[PDB]
Amino acid sequence: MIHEKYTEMRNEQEALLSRKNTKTSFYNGIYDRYEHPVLTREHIPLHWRYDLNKETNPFFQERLGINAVFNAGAIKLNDRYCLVARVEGNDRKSFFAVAESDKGTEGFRFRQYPVCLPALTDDETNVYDMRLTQHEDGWIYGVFCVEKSAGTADLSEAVASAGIARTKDLTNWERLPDLVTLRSPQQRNVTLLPEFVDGKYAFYTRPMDGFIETGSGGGIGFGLADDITHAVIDEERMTSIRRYHTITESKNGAGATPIKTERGWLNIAHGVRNTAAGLRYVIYCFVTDLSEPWKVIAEPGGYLIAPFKDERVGDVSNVVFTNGAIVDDNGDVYIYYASSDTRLHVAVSSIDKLLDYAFNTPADALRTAECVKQRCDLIKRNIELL
Amino acid sequence: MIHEKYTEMRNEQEALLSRKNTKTSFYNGIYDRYEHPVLTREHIPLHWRYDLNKETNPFFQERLGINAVFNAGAIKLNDRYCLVARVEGNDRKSFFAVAESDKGTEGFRFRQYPVCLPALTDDETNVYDMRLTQHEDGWIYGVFCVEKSAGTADLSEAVASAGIARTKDLTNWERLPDLVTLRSPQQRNVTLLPEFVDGKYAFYTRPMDGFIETGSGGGIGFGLADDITHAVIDEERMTSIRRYHTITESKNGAGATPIKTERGWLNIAHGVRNTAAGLRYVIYCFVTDLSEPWKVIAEPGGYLIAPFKDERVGDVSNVVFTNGAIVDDNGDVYIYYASSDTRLHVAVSSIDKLLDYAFNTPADALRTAECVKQRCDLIKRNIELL
Amino acid sequence: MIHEKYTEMRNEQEALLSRKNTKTSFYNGIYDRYEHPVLTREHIPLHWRYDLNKETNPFFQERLGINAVFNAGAIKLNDRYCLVARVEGNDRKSFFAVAESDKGTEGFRFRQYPVCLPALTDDETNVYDMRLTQHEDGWIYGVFCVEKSAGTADLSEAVASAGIARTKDLTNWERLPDLVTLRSPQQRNVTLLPEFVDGKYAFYTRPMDGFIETGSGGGIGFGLADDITHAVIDEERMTSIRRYHTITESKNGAGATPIKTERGWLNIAHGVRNTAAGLRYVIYCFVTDLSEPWKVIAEPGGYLIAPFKDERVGDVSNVVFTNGAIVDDNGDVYIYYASSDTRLHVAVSSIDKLLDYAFNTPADALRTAECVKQRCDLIKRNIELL
Ligand SMILES: OC[C@H]1O[C@@H](O[C@H]2[C@H](O)[C@@H](O)[C@H](O)O[C@@H]2CO)[C@@H](O)[C@@H](O)[C@@H]1O
Ligand SMILES: OC[C@H]1O[C@@H](O[C@H]2[C@H](O)[C@@H](O)[C@H](O)O[C@@H]2CO)[C@@H](O)[C@@H](O)[C@@H]1O
């Protein structure tokens, strides 16, 4: 009763799922790239997409296609690397699905079902880009974007807010009230710090006047909420901010969940600028202080990751983006970065390498002549050494 | 007197023109993709582009280059597959030219000359995207876009209308009056149904407030005109409409000429949405009722064709588009879809396959949590089967 | 003390620097393309980017990355082909650096240091796109864009002006006052003619109302300044202008420095139009009269160079751009054109070939039906010949 075409395609999918991944020749001394994505639309199990029944699907047509797999939350759970992937259906709605592997760079396979995330209202059209936090209160929190129609004459006009849900296993989710930020009508790129700050739940936020353009909103905010089960933030203290003629000029936002180090919170974030071709997204780092996490204590000039080779092209070209990283006990760091809103990659680094990058890459000299003086200082050091 | 360089380039062009095309490994159970485009700028005969005379063209320079070949009307005519291609010159003006083959997927060759299409006014700057209709009144009609300067201070401001011309052979064309739509100042993506409706000429239309943004214009309209030689439409009844967070959010429009089936009119159309990289065009289907062709009776969620691999990049990236299909008597369907406003491809399907897609692909569940429930229902069916 | 990783990477860089370049199969009878760029981010010497000291750079991390190398001025200097490249750092600021080769198409190597260009004010954030002029007054002039924050609430709002500097060697630069144009608040794509006109310094200019959109500004202007050391232009006489539905519709600007020929000034310039994917840049030619250099005496329809194959994609896709060419005494012409604001290419032609293109390529027929008549005339000539 299973269509004859299924077995051959299932065998091909199994081959893909198991395919080795290889470190490429890319080098910057900070992280490694890999030949293949860790997740693509073709990693979604065939029986999530095809009706296997030859009676009701005689031609074995794809009934529910997958358009893209990207922007994934990431966490280590019972010694497996777990990705809470943003999966965009053929119908253009995204949903979460979990893939796991015993390796950080290959072999990811989706669980039996996608994520059932309870809706709070009847007009939640999309949910996306979940950041996962292993919180000291004992829960795993997912903080994600919730998008609703604005209900105006402009059909494309939408409103973003931060959803909050918690879990022990990434299968069973308790949906808490959406975050309220008293000083901003919309939020995106919100993420929860793993530790209390002054006994409160602490977030990096991103206040926005609109759905695309931020305001008013000058950068990544830091905010405190008394109660995660009724989360309300008032003040949003600016941390890493938009700066003219830098990678963060148009807007910026937190990326991966804040990473705890002895030297501060390592924030792998994204910056946006406008070009003749549209918006360009890159990934950068900044470190915030442990006792004062609204205070930036390191921010290199420029980017850490930008679209490279085949990363440059996809549904939304000229974009790399991350909302997930995994840190192993030995200090290995797996940065899951998507490209062009289409596919998901991994970059492999370490805490020592990322901290050296963050603290020892020169700060942005901001103006061309000072940038040259800065680079000439380096050249002169090297020439002496030679 | 013919430049020595001509013979070698002519031999290379002949090799291209005759080159076999091969079905690729792409699979969705609905249509096949092919390795090569059916038409490109290099398919245009060398002697349409080069001055062959070595006296007046000593260096054998390309005098009238071709920039792109795309958005083609299509019709079967004396047992040949005929494409009325949109050919964009080096000078950025498009014109129509006919290519024919005895095969639907390869071997297309242009006729001796491009199309001489009489202008009605002295300010018709561009004509493009012709839909061909084999009408029951015995004529072949071409319905195309006519673009004129708006004549304002904004040099780029333009006005679109629907031109109508008829022919028996795609060489000799009678230019009729442009369509008038009393309730809309502009039109694009207009196409004529092959059959009368209540004794009148019937069109799918696309009312627009502006040259790029539609309004006001909520989707694809259905309209009736008493007289094709003085075509005037009043009411435009909405059919497939723009829907928030779907592939048709920003705008949509008819694509290929309506295809007659026993189950309704099969409309292979396009949907547009905005992204950080600009507008994204995909192709989708909807079926309208035979007795009430303003009434949509099937509309899958999502798209049928989206830019894939090398289709993604060109003059206008992230676009696929069709205004032509050919249906053989045995039910084979050839969908001619262009990518990125640069080149023309073919997708091969059948009426049975396209109808199964159209009626049996789940309708858009519109909101993420309902999309998941819908996909989980499919997964659960397949797991039981297993 | 030099990190062990340096030697292997230095050997790989040397291999790149020396790599042969090969003419491709591209043909239009006017210019040749080459397989490889003449300059990329990887051509920048490793010791401009890495700290070679293993004590201060234990992981051998890239401290000052290079994002792109493009839009280069070009001049022949002591029998070497010299490129004053726009080098964009990882931090998104550009600066000038000179590369030289004894061949026009390969083997380019950067000098010991980038260019130290004195700033006039403390708010010069970026400088870019220098056009080099070997002037009859005995100096080499560089005319470049100077960009400053507009200082408004809009962080991205910027102001462009034309900087002027002179040199004998491309190392030691005297920075003169920025050009003042009394009738336009901003300027970009300004270039100095190599000869006096009526005893004055003569420029092609590009008046602009804004930083991105021109106005008001209708095309490329011609202006005269009494004193290059206090350069002030009043009237800007229009030359090549924006034309609806041509490659120059949205805006245009001078490209490479005007090239002296017996038949007029050969201007290799750029044209811009808007598309669904963003702005598209192509390169075209026009010739101005020797005695009246505000007067256009040849302007082909269409473009000379457009993005081709891998040129199409980069930081700013769908762009080719030039602000540098080198003319050898034997008439060989090297056009240095960048693609997608990422990398720098060379196109090789000759004065005889470029003049034949400029004067004998049909003028734009402006409207589709007249474009067809024009092409049919050519076809008919060729068919007779056959
Ligand atoms: O698209 C690039 C990035 O934009 C953000 O999101 C999108 C979102 O993915 C779209 O579905 C929606 O239509 O509009 C948003 C535009 O901001 C960013 O946070 C990422 O989600 C995305 O990669
Ligand atoms: O460009 C994508 C699609 O846009 C529509 O047309 C263009 C037209 O091709 C351009 O020449 C003109 O400048 O503006 C229009 C923008 O809508 C669409 O119907 C297709 O023609 C085209 O593939």
Ligand SMILES: OC[C@H]1O[C@@H](O[C@H]2[C@H](O)[C@@H](O)[C@H](O)O[C@@H]2CO)[C@@H](O)[C@@H](O)[C@@H]1O
């Ligand atoms: O980007 C395409 C072309 O735009 C012009 O310049 C840019 C400039 O390079 C950017 O750094 C700045 O942010 O905005 C300008 C937009 O016009 C053009 O003259 C070239 O510089 C560039 O290739």
